[PDB]
Write a protein that binds this ligand. Structure first.
Ligand code: G3H
Ligand code: CL
Ligand code: CL
Ligand code: CL
Lengths: 249, 251
C-alpha cells in the first residue's frame, strides 16, 4: 500500500489522536516547498466531499488559495447528486469566496448563489441591506448549508493581507491571535479573539452543518492548524506532511 | 487519501492483474500533469528506503522517470550505507538520460557514494574488448553483479528506439519483431519475450533473478500497454505507477 509505505496511515491515526478531528487526510509532501502539493490536497478534498454528499447539498465555501485549488480539481459528481454552492461569508467596509464558489459550481456542473459586494457604507445602510428580501434569501441559504469547505490561515498573514483597521490590528496582536478561519481570529487555545465585520456564516452556525472539511497545509501553518483544532469542530482535515510532521515532531 | 481517491482498491486490482510483488499507485496521469512523475519519484524513494538493508548496492537505470526518483531522493534517516551503480550503459541515450548521470545524482541526493561507468555503445570490437578489461570497468562490473537492489524504468519500445541513437539496422528489427516495451536495454514483445537486446556492459536480464529487491517506476496512459507487456513474465518486482497507466491497463 502507498499510504503504508509513505507512512501516511499511521500518521493520520496519530494526528486524529492529537487534534480535535473527525478524520485526518494527509497527502505527501510540504506545500510550502512543492507547489503542486496544494493540487493533491485539492484532489483529496474533492474526493472527500463526494463521499459525504447527500441527495441534495448546499455547499458553503471560503475564498483562499487552497480552496481555489479544491475548485480547480472539482469534477462532476458520478452519482449526479444535487449541488448548490454559496460563499460562506462576505466582508463589509471584492469577495474572493464568490469567485471560488462560481468556479467550483461550474466545475461540478452545479448551481450557485453569490453574495452582494457593497461599497463602503454606514452600519445603518448595511443593516437595511441585509433585510432586503433578495439578500436575505441568499443569507438564509447559507444558514441552510449542508457542507462547509474552508481554509485555515496564520492570523498575522491574513490580517495584513486584508485591509485591516489599525485599531483591529492592535486588538489582534494584543490578544495573541495565531490562526484564522472563515472570518474569525483565534488564539493558541482556539478561542475567538476577533471577528471580521461580515455577513453570512457565524461560528455558532458550524455546529449545525453536518459536514465540515478544512483544507490547509504546509509547514508554516502547523501552529495555526494546531490552534484552530484545540477545540472540537467536528471537522475532517485535509492536510499534507509538511504540516502534519511539523505538528507531530 | 488513497482510500478516498480509490487508489487502495486500484493497487490491489493492479497487483493481481500483473502478478507483482506489490503495486504502489499515485493520483492522476503523468501525461497531462507533469507533477505526477514527481509523486511517483517520491513513492519510489519510500519504497526503496523500506527495503534497504544495513549495507546496499543499488543498481540504477536512466530515463526521465528514474531521474525524478533521484530528484526526490533524500538521505536515509536510519543512516544505512548506500552505494549506487549504473545497471548498464552504452544504450544510446543523451547524457541527461544516462544511467551513469542519474546514478550519480541519486547518490548525491542520498548522501551516498557512487561509481562511474561510461562505456559507449558504438565502440569497435577491438576498442570494446580492450575497454572492458580496464581495472575501473572490471571493478564496477563486479560491483553491479553484487547489486542488492535494482531501480528501473519501463518504456514504450517505439519511444525508446527513437530517443536513443538506434542504428538503422536495429530499428527495423524492433519494428519487424513487434516490440512494444523496453527495460534496461532489452526490447520485449506483447508476451514479455525478448526480441532485441542492446549490446552493452553490465547487468544482463538473467541477472535480475538474483536481485532480491527490484523496483520498477513507470506511468502515464501512454505506457499502459508497455507496462502490461513487460509483466507478462514473472519479474518478482514492485511497480510504482500512476492512475493514468493503471486505470487504462485495467480498462
Ligand atoms: O528504459 C526505460 C526508461 O529509459 C524510460 O524513460 P522515461 O522514464 O523517460 O520514459
Ligand atoms: Cl515535498
Ligand atoms: Cl485557503
Ligand atoms: Cl448569483
Amino acid at each position: 500500500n502507498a499510504k503504508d509505505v509513505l507512512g501516511l496511515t499511521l500518521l493520520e491515526k496519530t494526528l486524529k489522536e492529537r487534534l480535535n478531528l473527525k478524520d485526518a487526510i494527509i497527502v505527501s509532501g510540504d506545500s510550502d516547498q512543492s507547489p503542486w502539493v496544494k493540487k493533491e490536497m485539492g484532489r483529496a478534498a474533492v474526493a472527500c466531499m463526494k463521499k459525504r454528499f447527500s441527495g441534495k447539498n448546499i455547499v458553503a465555501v471560503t475564498g483562499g488559495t487552497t480552496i481555489e485549488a479544491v475548485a480547480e480539481m472539482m469534477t462532476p459528481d458520478s452519482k449526479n447528486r444535487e449541488l448548490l454552492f454559496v460563499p460562506a461569508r462576505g466582508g463589509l467596509g471584492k469577495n474572493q469566496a464568490n469567485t471560488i464558489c462560481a468556479h467550483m459550481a461550474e466545475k461540478a456542473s452545479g448551481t450557485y448563489r453569490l453574495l452582494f459586494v457593497p461599497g463602503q457604507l454606514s452600519q445603518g445602510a448595511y443593516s437595511s441591506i441585509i433585510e432586503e428580501p433578495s439578500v436575505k434569501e441568499v443569507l438564509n441559504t447559507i444558514k441552510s448549508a449542508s457542507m462547509l469547505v474552508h481554509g485555515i490561515g496564520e492570523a498575522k498573514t491574513m490580517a495584513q493581507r486584508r485591509n485591516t483597521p489599525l485599531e483591529d490590528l492592535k486588538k489582534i496582536d494584543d490578544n495573541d491571535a495565531v490562526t484564522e478561519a472563515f472570518g474569525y481570529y483565534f488564539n493558541a487555545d482556539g478561542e475567538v479573539v476577533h471577528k471580521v465585520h461580515s455577513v453570512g456564516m457565524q461560528l455558532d452556525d458550524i455546529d449545525a452543518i453536518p459536514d465540515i472539511i478544512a483544507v490547509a497545509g504546509g509547514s508554516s501553518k502547523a501552529e495555526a492548524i494546531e490552534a484552530y483544532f484545540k477545540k472540537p469542530r467536528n471537522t475532517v482535515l485535509v492536510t499534507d506532511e509538511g504540516a502534519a510532521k511539523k505538528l507531530l515532531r
